[PDB]
């Protein structure tokens, strides 16, 4: 949902930039003013939706100025148009702040996920309550991997999650082989995490191997 | 509201650490388990209140393990106690993530505030709608300065904000002298912003000067 907004907002700002540049300081076109206003209003909506407060404030500020400009309360001139460009650039900088946001964020995830895998490992090695715990730890890793676009990690965890959902509810019967496959999945997920930790790409061979094994179990346990 | 939680949570984690260390692996005390649980539950509440999701997840995980331990579903041993210490450390690391969070955040503020001062400047130099705009720009700077503990910047902006509130509503009559005091306040606020930008302390002489002048106007306009 975030990236759709970022792609649209970038496009809108590129449109805003051209319309601002096409403004006639002595006699501005209310149609170009309306275009800049529409693009700013669209960005405001998204910024509010996702809690992009710095962007929200930057947009409100341009909106206000534009509302005076398009209604005729503000006298336009070169200086004012330059201010509008700076507000547009501020909106761009704020958008990029929220678009960016990593490192401290990546590290907190890497550290958190490392710990959750240890918890999963031990609970496997040890009850519906524990199955609910392994399930939720996998659910977090999947969710978080989805957040960072870690497609390979997300998929591995998702396949194990579905098996853990059937295990916790009581739809699927568990045994030593199944548990060892879950432990093997844990090891693969750690390597997937480590590859991303080192800004490398996870092992495709391991991914295909574990996903075949997890889907095999989804059939075998039924 | 944030710092009260951070101070309490730090204390709770220090308590948790001692109770975990005082656990008897062969025959644990349900009272020490309850203490660790209470401290974890308290931290969970705050984490939920402020949207500290990474912390929330780290706490849920310890909570779950502790609920098995205190109820007797989990067999304790040295390894399990070490895992509890790691979960406690994770909770500490997550707390510190949310406690920290700056730089990219400081820079976005510095850049945003720089632009808002320019907008304020020009609108002063130029209507209740514009007075509402200068007011809100000051309101943002005050709010944001409050967020970063910039007491001197917050106070300067707050005093001007109250004057801007009376100006926008129509309680206070404005003139050239008042506007020039507002422009002078803008210059002081920029220097206050710049001092913090360079990790320096704002000018105390300017602060006292402008606050006397702003309070003088609060009396003079009435």
């Amino acid at each position: 949902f975030y990236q759709t907004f970022f792609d649209e907002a970038d496009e809108l700002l590129a449109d805003m930039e051209q319309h601002l540049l096409d403004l006639v300081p002595e006699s501005p076109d209310a149609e170009q003013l309306n275009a800049i206003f529409r693009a700013a209003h669209s960005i405001k909506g998204g910024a509010g939706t996702f809690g992009f407060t710095m962007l929200q404030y930057a947009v409100e500020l341009m909106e206000n100025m534009l509302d005076f400009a398009r209604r005729g309360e503000m006298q336009l001139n070169t200086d004012i148009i330059n201010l509008f460009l700076e507000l547009k650039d501020l909106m761009q900088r704020m958008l990029d702040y929220y678009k960016n946001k990593p490192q401290s964020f990546y590290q907190a995830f890497f550290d958190m996920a490392d710990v959750m895998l240890k918890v999963m490992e031990q609970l496997l090695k040890l009850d519906a309550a524990m199955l609910n715990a392994i399930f939720r730890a996998a659910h977090f890793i999947k969710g978080a991997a989805g957040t960072f676009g870690f497609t390979i990690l997300q998929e591995t965890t998702h396949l194990m999650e579905n098996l853990l959902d059937e295990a916790r509810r009581g739809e699927m019967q568990l045994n030593t082989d199944i548990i060892n496959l879950f432990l093997e999945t844990k090891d693969i997920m750690q390597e997937q995490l480590d590859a991303y930790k080192n800004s490398e790409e996870p092992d495709a061979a391991s991914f295909e191997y574990i996903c075949n094994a997890l889907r095999q179990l989804a059939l075998e346990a039924k």
Side-chain angles (χ1 to χ4, degrees), chain A residues 1-212:
Chain A
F1 292 97
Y2 262 50
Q3 199 59 46
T4 293
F5 169 71
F6 297 128
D7 294 346
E8 262 171 36
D10 278 339
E11 287 173 354
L12 289 165
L13 289 166
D15 285 351
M16 270 199 47
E17 172 91 38
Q18 189 68 60
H19 297 310
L20 280 164
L21 290 174
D22 296 332
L23 282 167
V24 186
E26 292 202 42
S27 267
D29 186 359
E31 241 125 56
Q32 291 159 336
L33 293 158
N34 273 347
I36 298 153
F37 183 80
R38 280 153 196 219
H41 189 279
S42 295
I43 292 163
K44 185 238 287 205
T49 301
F50 304 117
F52 302 162
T53 46
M54 302 275 244
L55 182 57
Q56 253 170 314
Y57 274 104
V59 179
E60 288 178 46
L61 201 64
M62 183 138 190
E63 235 196 355
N64 289 341
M65 304 258 285
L66 288 164
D67 244 330
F68 311 139
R70 76 187 187 116
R71 291 166 184 270
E73 300 156 57
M74 202 180 194
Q75 181 213 282
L76 232 69
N77 60 41
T78 299
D79 318 62
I80 286 155
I81 293 166
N82 287 333
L83 236 165
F84 278 140
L85 290 154
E86 290 200 293
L87 290 178
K88 177 261 148 140
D89 290 334
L90 185 54
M91 285 173 71
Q92 182 68 66
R93 283 186 313 254
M94 290 309 100
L95 186 67
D96 289 334
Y97 166 70
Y98 293 105
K99 185 187 294 181
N100 231 63
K101 292 257 236 203
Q103 260 321 120
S104 61
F105 188 44
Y106 266 69
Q107 254 42 55
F109 165 68
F110 287 138
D111 159 33
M112 173 131 309
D114 279 337
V115 179
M116 282 198 161
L117 290 168
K118 280 188 183 186
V119 175
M120 276 178 85
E121 189 183 66
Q122 296 300 97
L123 292 169
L124 284 163
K125 288 180 177 201
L126 290 173
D127 188 343
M130 284 193 244
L131 288 172
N132 188 73
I134 301 154
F135 171 83
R136 296 300 284 200
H139 180 74
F140 171 77
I141 301 161
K142 186 199 77 182
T147 296
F148 301 98
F150 300 151
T151 291
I152 282 164
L153 177 64
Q154 188 191 34
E155 289 313 280
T156 304
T157 47
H158 205 1
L159 287 170
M160 182 177 182
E161 185 193 17
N162 287 337
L163 293 169
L164 296 167
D165 193 68
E166 263 62 88
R168 75 194 186 98
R169 286 183 174 157
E171 272 177 278
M172 286 176 185
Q173 46 195 0
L174 304 172
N175 62 45
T176 302
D177 301 63
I178 294 164
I179 292 159
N180 285 340
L181 188 55
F182 284 159
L183 167 87
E184 208 175 41
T185 305
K186 181 271 157 196
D187 297 340
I188 298 302
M189 292 179 316
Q190 189 62 60
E191 292 174 357
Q192 285 166 358
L193 190 68
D194 292 350
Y196 305 126
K197 202 174 189 171
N198 294 319
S199 302
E200 292 180 357
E201 243 63 69
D203 186 19
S206 280
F207 175 70
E208 293 200 11
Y209 162 79
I210 207 70
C211 293
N212 289 337

